[PDB]
């Protein structure tokens, strides 16, 4: 009945002076726009239908046409930035924000969805959505004693749209908007739905992806223990953002990093550093690299938790991008670590896999590895042990690889290598 209309049929119906014909044509547009294969968004826009859809959002008297137009506009806004812009340029933002108050849950939800798509376009529309006042009404939809009474899909859509208001940088969301949203995120982070948890973790990962003052806003809210708990979830869609968030947090201060350690994060890293999902291993190792860039007592907790053998493991065998993060973890470890900690690292077998990576066709990892070799030697001469160390490097082919690096197409590489070959070989 409303299936497979032409755009011109839709235009004809929406231009009739007949609200029911308009509703029928808007639903036909919605069904057109709801098919996964090549929805004719541009034809719909070119036909001038967005302003009509937007005007239909205001027809409180005809809630079906609000819903159908909200859904049509949601799917136009889900398209390209130009398509989202067409929706915004039609005045949809204030019209959707007004629909958040709709008594019809499926219309309110659709407006949530539409605003998520608009905000999800980028910082400017995100901030324009915020400036139009979306946050208060969005959070009010979550102002219930127990989130579990909300419809599952509705709560998921709200959490997702909130995460888009937290998303994107240059600029990051307004500080006041973040402070306004955070209490609700913290609460969603304790909800038991895996998708709400995933999107809540994504939102926190966005908010912690910035300067330490941004991290601090999040950490002050006490979420780190919950993020660590979610770090141990079985659902990869949860572990992924929880780990991103934790990784972001340990890019901050030593005190912020220490909150992650105190929360027990390190006990999860045996699994994370051996995780069969490549991106988990990579992000876990990146996280480790920023923990080993911290204080010596923080390095010591990496040690006590038995994570140095896991770093040796990653360095020995992993996706190359993960090995590069592991190399950073080692150079940070050796830059900041006591002599005893660096000795322990050698006793765990770091030398051989470090050496094997010096044959990487990647200039940055070579530099990183050479820094670490240098830092390990520095600790050796504090013990009169450079000879034992040099043998080790020779015993596993490392001396050969440091030799070839002297003649290498890069200043810092040839420099640091040549230095090693004479200061210790």
């Amino acid at each position: 009945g409303t299936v497979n209309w032409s755009v011109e049929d839709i235009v004809k119906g929406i231009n009739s002076n007949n609200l029911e014909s308009q509703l029928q044509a808007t639903q036909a547009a919605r069904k057109l726009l709801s098919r996964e294969k090549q929805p004719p968004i541009d034809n719909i826009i070119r036909a001038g239908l967005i302003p009509k859809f937007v005007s239909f959002l205001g027809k409180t008297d005809c809630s079906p046409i609000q819903f159908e137009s909200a859904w049509a506009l949601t799917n136009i806004a889900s398209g390209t930035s130009e398509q989202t812009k067409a929706v915004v340029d039609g005045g949809a933002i204030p019209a959707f924000i007004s629909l958040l108050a709709s008594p019809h849950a499926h219309i309110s939800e659709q407006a949530v969805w539409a605003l998520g798509n608009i905000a999800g376009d980028g910082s400017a529309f995100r901030d324009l959505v915020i400036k139009h006042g979306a946050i208060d009404p969005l959070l009010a939809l979550l102002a219930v004693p127990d989130l579990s009474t909300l419809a599952c899909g509705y709560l998921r859509n709200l959490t997702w749209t909130l995460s888009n208001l937290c998303r994107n940088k240059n600029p990051a969301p307004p500080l006041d908007a973040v402070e306004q949203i955070l209490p609700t995120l913290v609460r969603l982070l304790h909800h038991n739905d895996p998708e709400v948890l995933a999107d809540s973790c994504w939102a926190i990962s966005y908010l912690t992806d910035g300067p330490n003052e941004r991290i601090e806003m999040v950490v002050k809210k006490g979420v780190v223990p919950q993020l660590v708990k979610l770090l141990g979830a079985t659902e990869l869609p949860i572990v992924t953002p929880a780990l991103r968030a934790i990784g972001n947090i340990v890019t901050g201060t030593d005190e912020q990093t220490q909150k992650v350690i105190d929360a027990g994060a390190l006990a999860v890293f045996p699994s994370l550093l051996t995780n069969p999902k490549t991106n988990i291993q990579k992000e876990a190792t990146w996280t480790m690299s920023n923990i080993t860039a911290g204080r010596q007592d923080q390095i010591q907790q990496v040690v006590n938790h038995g994570l140095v053998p896991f770093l040796v493991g990653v360095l020995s065998k992993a996706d190359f991008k993960t090995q590069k993060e592991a190399a950073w973890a080692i150079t940070n470890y050796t830059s900041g670590g006591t002599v005893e900690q660096i000795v322990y690292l050698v006793h765990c077998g770091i030398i051989e896999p470090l050496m094997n990576l010096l044959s990487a066709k990647d200039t940055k990892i070579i530099q990183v590895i050479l820094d670490a070799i240098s830092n390990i030697f520095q600790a050796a001469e504090k013990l009169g042990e450079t000879e034992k160390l040099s043998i080790m490097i020779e015993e596993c082919g490392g001396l050969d690889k440091i030799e070839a690096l002297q003649r290498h197409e890069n200043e810092s590489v040839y420099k640091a290598s040549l230095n090693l070959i004479e200061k210790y070989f």
Partner: peptide, 13 residues
């Protein structure tokens, strides 16, 4: 020495 989800979703059903 520290170093530092679909955004848009159509409704199909």
């Amino acid at each position: 020495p520290k170093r530092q989800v679909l955004a848009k979703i159509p409704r199909r059903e």
